Enzyme design. Structure first.
Site, short mmCIF file in Angstrom:
data_model
loop_
_atom_site.label_atom_id
_atom_site.label_comp_id
_atom_site.label_asym_id
_atom_site.label_seq_id
_atom_site.Cartn_x
_atom_site.Cartn_y
_atom_site.Cartn_z
CG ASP A 113 59.84 21.14 -13.04
OD1 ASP A 113 58.61 21.13 -13.23
OD2 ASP A 113 60.67 21.17 -13.98
CD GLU A 142 65.33 12.01 -11.19
OE1 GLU A 142 64.86 13.17 -11.02
OE2 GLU A 142 64.61 10.99 -11.19
CE1 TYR A 187 60.89 11.95 -9.38
CE2 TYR A 187 62.83 12.95 -8.40
CZ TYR A 187 62.05 12.69 -9.50
OH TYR A 187 62.45 13.17 -10.72
C1 LIG Z 1 66.22 19.77 -12.22
C2 LIG Z 1 64.83 19.30 -12.45
O1 LIG Z 1 64.04 19.90 -13.17
N1 LIG Z 1 64.49 18.18 -11.81
C3 LIG Z 1 63.15 17.64 -11.97
C4 LIG Z 1 62.69 16.90 -10.60
O2 LIG Z 1 62.68 17.83 -9.51
C5 LIG Z 1 61.23 16.34 -10.77
F1 LIG Z 1 60.40 17.03 -10.56
C6 LIG Z 1 61.03 15.74 -12.19
C7 LIG Z 1 60.08 14.57 -12.26
O3 LIG Z 1 59.12 14.50 -11.48
O4 LIG Z 1 60.34 13.70 -13.15
O5 LIG Z 1 62.32 15.44 -12.73
C8 LIG Z 1 62.86 16.70 -13.15
C9 LIG Z 1 61.61 17.22 -13.86
C10 LIG Z 1 61.47 16.91 -15.37
O6 LIG Z 1 61.50 15.51 -15.71
C11 LIG Z 1 62.57 17.61 -16.17
O7 LIG Z 1 63.82 16.93 -16.07
O8 LIG Z 1 60.49 16.72 -13.07
#
Ligand SMILES: CC(=O)N[C@@H]1[C@@H](O)[C@@H](F)[C@]2(C(=O)O)O[C@H]1[C@@H]([C@H](O)CO)O2
Length: 658
Positions: free
Chosen positions: A232, A503, A615
């Site tokens: 990310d 989410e 996801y």
């Molecule tokens: C905006 C953002 O970072 N969004 C992220 C998403 O794109 C994901 F990849 C994820 C995840 O896989 O949980 O959720 C968050 C991130 C992590 O949990 C921090 O919130 O990883």
């Protein structure tokens, strides 16, 4: 070239099959290709599909194997003790197990190329690894090989890695077949790819799929095109889109909905070794987490996503600053100029850069692409490329000039280093996207932006109201527009967890009644309800019958148009596991008209409980089939980073689910 050995319909029932007499005396030269069509819907924890070994006492480490794990990982071992070689190449999440309750025939192609000293593995038409070595070991050249085995490896006379499954076809060739030849081998895939490595995005990785069925019947998809591995933000990530006009059978070549150009769009093989896998593009701006909705009044498609300035992600985004200055109930984007220690500028109407210390406009303007102009003239910056040629990640100027953007590291004027939300629109149902505009801040001057809930927004059936769910610490923050996304207001709904990646996705149970399903930190999916088109929200309830991990995973949800068992139906897509992002399911819930409670009556397993599922996006296709685009791997696991072609699409019918 024709095969030197071809066999079929072998049942592997925890008992190896000897094919030595058939195969060993046919192996010659130092290059080989193995083509195998196999099923394994109930695999053992670790099992070999094929083995070539020295079975003699004292030579237990002289063998070649193709093995798999019940995680879906595929790999090979190539070992010769006399040569002092012990090669182990593999990739997690490379297999299918079951589709529509029937075992999937995986097509595996393994190429052992002595001339290029490279070992390459493909599964289901996807290259899962390609490894070049200094000292090449031909697979039938291992010292004293005397056994060719299916469903185990014979070591010192005993069966190791016993397999459960079946090999419906196996062929071997005394040649390293070309990539073009590999591509002609017939497949029996239960899935298709919409976005994939080498397509128009040039991203080697993808995450965060969405799907949305437009009123014309066109089905639209968006995704994070992730360049710097699957990390990310901070990284380089663009938002890409593709559509289908034939109920998901074929898909358009992707285009970008939102893109930055401060870094080159590079197709890079991100390192997966423990020392380098956390290498992260650190000076690029990015977009992340997109969401789509269609507006009835204008007919426009609307796409939002988070926007991250150069080197910024959720981890280091300034939580105490919206990046906007408040004036008279108007919000203006703040800017910091090269050499200043404060943000002494703002962007006002018509993009005029204004000096706050003297209250004078400057000779700078910001255009509609957030690019910097001086006296109407476009400023530029030099682009960066990334490489691991030095043995670590390097980000360096590449000689190309690109328009100077306020979200860039090298810009004369720079935005506050925090997270924003942007929107873009399409007038042609995803054939092109407009330049994005930033949404205003909703929680005041001294609060960072909320985080967009990826997937779909909600277009209420009986009005022009559009809703996008977002989340922040301690609440869901619904963004509501009644004027085609021209203006937005928030509706806050408190939730009883702090620090949650909450989410959320919404369904309209009936006119004006919205149920939102969301990720929590409790191991259970939560929900809340609005009965006034999103103005107010109920307290939070939890779903029993589905398990998530402590950190949770995005859940996608739709209201199905048809009755099921005579009742209104909602379909949820989520992993169902307390342990990891695996055990993907569609869960069909029937609505109780008496109180709007939902009975989760049917659970459809997308693939094995042990196979990855993260996801996801679901949509009701125009023909009432269900389209599912999902991450087929554990996107949390630190062992499954940087996998290509794992976001995959399948078509299901309701009868498959029930
Ligand atoms: C905006 C953002 O970072 N969004 C992220 C998403 O794109 C994901 F990849 C994820 C995840 O896989 O949980 O959720 C968050 C991130 C992590 O949990 C921090 O919130 O990883």
């Amino acid at each position: 070239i024709s095969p030197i050995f071809q066999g079929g319909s072998y049942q592997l029932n925890n008992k190896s099959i000897d094919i030595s007499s058939l195969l060993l005396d046919k192996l010659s030269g130092e290059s080989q290709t193995v083509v195998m069509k196999f099923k394994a819907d109930k695999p053992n924890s670790l099992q070999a599909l094929f083995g070539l070994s020295n079975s003699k006492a004292g030579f237990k480490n002289n063998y070649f194997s193709i093995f798999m794990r019940d995680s879906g990982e595929i790999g090979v071992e190539i070992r010769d003790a006399q040569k002092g070689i012990n090669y182990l190449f593999s990739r997690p999440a490379s297999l299918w197990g079951k589709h529509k309750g029937q075992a999937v025939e995986n097509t595996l192609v393994f190429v052992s190329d002595s001339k290029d000293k490279t070992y390459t593995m493909y599964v289901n038409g996807i290259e899962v690894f390609s490894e070049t070595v200094d000292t090449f070991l031909p697979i039938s050249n291992i010292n004293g090989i005397d056994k060719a085995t299916l469903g185990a490896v014979n070591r010192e006379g005993k069966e190791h890695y016993l397999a459960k499954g079946s090999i419906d076809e196996i062929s071997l060739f005394n040649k390293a077949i070309s990539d073009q030849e590999v591509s002609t081998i017939p497949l029996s895939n239960p899935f298709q790819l919409i976005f994939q490595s080498g397509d128009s995005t040039q991203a080697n990785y993808f995450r965060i799929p969405t799907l949305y069925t437009l009123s014309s019947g066109r089905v639209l998809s968006s995704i994070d095109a992730r360049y710097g591995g699957t990390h990310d933000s901070k990284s380089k990530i663009n938002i890409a889109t593709s559509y289908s006009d034939d109920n998901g059978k074929t898909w358009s070549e992707p285009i970008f909905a939102m893109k930055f150009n401060d870094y080159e769009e590079q197709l890079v093989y991100w390192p997966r070794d423990n020392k380098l896998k956390n290498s992260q593009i650190s000076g690029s701006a990015s977009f992340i987490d997109s969401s789509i909705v269609e507006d009835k009044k204008s007919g426009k498609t609307i796409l939002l996503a988070d926007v991250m300035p150069a080197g910024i992600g959720n981890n280091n985004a300034n939580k105490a600053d919206s990046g906007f200055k408040e004036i008279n109930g108007h919000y203006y984007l703040k800017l910091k100029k090269n050499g200043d220690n404060d943000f002494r500028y703002t962007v006002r109407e018509n993009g005029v850069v204004y000096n706050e210390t003297t209250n004078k406009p400057t000779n700078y303007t910001i255009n509609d692409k957030y690019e910097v102009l001086e006296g109407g003239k476009s400023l530029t910056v030099e682009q960066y490329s990334v490489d691991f040629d030095s043995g670590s990640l390097r980000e360096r100027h590449n000689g190309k000039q690109v328009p100077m953007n306020v979200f860039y590291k090298d810009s004369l004027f720079k935005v506050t280093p925090t997270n924003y939300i942007a929107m873009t629109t399409s007038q042609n149902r995803g054939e092109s996207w407009e330049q994005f505009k930033l949404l205003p801040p909703f929680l005041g001057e001294k609060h960072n932006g909320t985080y967009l809930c990826p997937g779909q927004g909600l277009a209420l059936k009986s009005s022009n109201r559009l809703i996008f769910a977002t989340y922040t610490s301690g609440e869901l923050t619904y963004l509501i527009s009644d004027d085609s996304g021209q203006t937005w207001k928030k509706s806050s709904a408190s939730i009883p967890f702090k620090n949650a990646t909450a989410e959320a996705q919404m369904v309209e149970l009936r006119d004006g009644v919205i149920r939102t399903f969301f990720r929590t930190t409790t191991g259970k999916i939560a929900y809340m309800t609005s009965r006034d088109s999103g103005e107010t929200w109920s307290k939070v309830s939890y779903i029993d019958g589905i398990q998530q991990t402590s950190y949770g995973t995005q859940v996608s949800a739709i209201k199905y148009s048809q009755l099921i068992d005579g009742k209104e139906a909602v379909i949820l897509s989520t992993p169902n596991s307390r342990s990891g992002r695996k055990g993907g399911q569609l869960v069909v819930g029937l609505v109780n008209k008496e109180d709007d409670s939902i009975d989760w009556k049917y659970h459809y397993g997308i693939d094995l409980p042990s196979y990855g599922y993260a996801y996801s996006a679901i949509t009701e296709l125009p023909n009432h089939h269900i389209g599912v685009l999902f991450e087929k791997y554990d996107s949390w696991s630190r062992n499954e980073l940087h996998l290509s072609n794992v976001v995959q699409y399948i078509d299901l019918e309701i009868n498959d689910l029930t």
